[PDB]
Design a protein around this ligand. Sequence first.
Ligand code: UMP
Lengths: 118, 137
Amino acid sequence: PPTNAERLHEFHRAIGAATPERPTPPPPELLRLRQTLLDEESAEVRAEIDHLLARQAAGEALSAGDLAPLAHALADLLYVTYGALDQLGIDADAVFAEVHRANLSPADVRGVIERLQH
Amino acid sequence: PPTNAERLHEFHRAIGATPERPTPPPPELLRLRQTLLDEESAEVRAEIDHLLARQAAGEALSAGDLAPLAHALADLLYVTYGALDQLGIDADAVFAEVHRANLSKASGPRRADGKQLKPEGWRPADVRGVIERLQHA
Ligand SMILES: O=c1ccn([C@H]2C[C@H](O)[C@@H](COP(=O)(O)O)O2)c(=O)[nH]1
């Protein structure tokens, strides 16, 4: 099964978006787009959390189905976060794995980037 | 090979914190996840602003210079995956549904900054149906 990071690679290739094989310093325009998309989706997460909190405050008993907009927005946020890493040429899974290693047990992301060049 | 969502599950088992099926959370837990999302987002925002300033000064960035951004981005994945896992929601099921509906945008126009937009007749992911599938075994 494809990982979510590999899925981003498929998406960018299907839309004609830069998706380099190895870590690649980016043009400013790429950085600016990635910041915009991250701001867009994290605002949507925030708004969907605010709706849940407001309903709960008024006594509503949330159902599982009631979580679908927030889950959708959280997945959208994953999507643009992975997307930033993909457009930088950086294997997100390799960086996530090193972060996970440190949390589970210090993350050397600089070392992962260096290794990804080769 | 474990996915990143499954790694978050492992991490939550290791620290003593999560449901198997979608479960409405207590409000305090929501406020907590928002706080964690807000802290890692701000790190990402400042690091990109950091790199943008260096380029505006004329610096040619190297791949090595990308490590704090890559680190901040992975921390953001971690707490975003963590949010879905504490909700009892399988991130990979949701993501696969979001992904299929993003692939279907390929023929749409593009915004000036490069954002892919939706073509005529596009239809969104049915994340409600994913939740119901997850809720009902
Ligand atoms: O250039 C783009 C345009 C869209 N998306 C994905 C992120 C979200 O999953 C979703 C957001 O699209 P909008 O609903 O905001 O148009 O599409 C990208 O990854 N890159």
